[PDB]
Amino acid sequence: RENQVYSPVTGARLVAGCICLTPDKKQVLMITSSAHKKRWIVPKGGVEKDEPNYETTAQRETWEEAGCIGKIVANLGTVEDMRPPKDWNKDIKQFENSRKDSEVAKHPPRTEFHFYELEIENLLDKFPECHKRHRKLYSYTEAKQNLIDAKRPELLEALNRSAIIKDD
Ligand SMILES: O=P(O)(O)O[C@H]1[C@@H](OP(=O)(O)O)[C@H](OP(=O)(O)O)[C@@H](OP(=O)(O)OP(=O)(O)O)[C@H](OP(=O)(O)O)[C@H]1OP(=O)(O)O
Numbered sequence: 001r002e003n004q005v006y007s008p009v010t011g012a013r014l015v016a017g018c019i020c021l022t023p024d025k026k027q028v029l030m031i032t033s034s035a036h037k038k039r040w041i042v043p044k045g046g047v048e049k050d051e052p053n054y055e056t057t058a059q060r061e062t063w064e065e066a067g068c069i070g071k072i073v074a075n076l077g078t079v080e081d082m083r084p085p086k087d088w089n090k091d092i093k094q095f096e097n098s099r100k101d102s103e104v105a106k107h108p109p110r111t112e113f114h115f116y117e118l119e120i121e122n123l124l125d126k127f128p129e130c131h132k133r134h135r136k137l138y139s140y141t142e143a144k145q146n147l148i149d150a151k152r153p154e155l156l157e158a159l160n161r162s163a164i165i166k167d168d
């Protein structure tokens with residue numbers, strides 16, 4: 001329902017989420033997508049009209065989606081879902097070509113993500129989406145492949161900004 005907050009400039013849906021790392025920073029916590037059960041992503045969701053800051057949304061969604069509690073240790077800034085709309089692929093005008101490069105036809109972002117790095121302090125067996133999702137730790141190498149397979153490079157960008165150890 002329309003508790004959802006949108007960018008006043010681009011109309012993009014405002015979403016906050018967490019890159020949750022182990023204290024030793026060797027693994028990130030990932031969740032299966034609701035719609036597609038074999039796609040691994042990170043906890044995130046729409047900011048609601050009442051919420052005073054993005055941190056609130058981020059920790060609310062990390063609890064609801066992954067039953068994960070911890071402390072925010074870093075602001076990882078913003079990334080955008082630049083997937084085109086659903087009008088695409090049956091459109092006549094689809095790509096815009098340069099001289100030494102090619103691009104998708106100009107469009108506003110679907111979603112503007114505000115990501116935070118969280119140090120995991122606890123994982124609980126019962127959480128709201130307990131029976132709707134799976135939730136597992138993954139090394140950088142394994143996490144990177146998950147987000148490529150999921151078709152979510154913007155979530156990988158968020159992950160790359162974190163203090164996760166990539167040398168493995
Ligand atoms: O298209 P869909 O309905 O199949 O689901 C998409 C997305 O729609 P879009 O990408 O076209 O905008 C959903 O947004 P909406 O449906 O609320 O508009 C989004 O929920 P979200 O943004 O996290 O919002 P919160 O409810 O957490 O606040 C959902 O994440 P999941 O929560 O895991 O399902 C996404 O699948 P993926 O993220 O890959 O798993």
Ligand SMILES: [Mg+2]
Binds near residue numbers: 044046
């Ligand atoms: Mg969500």
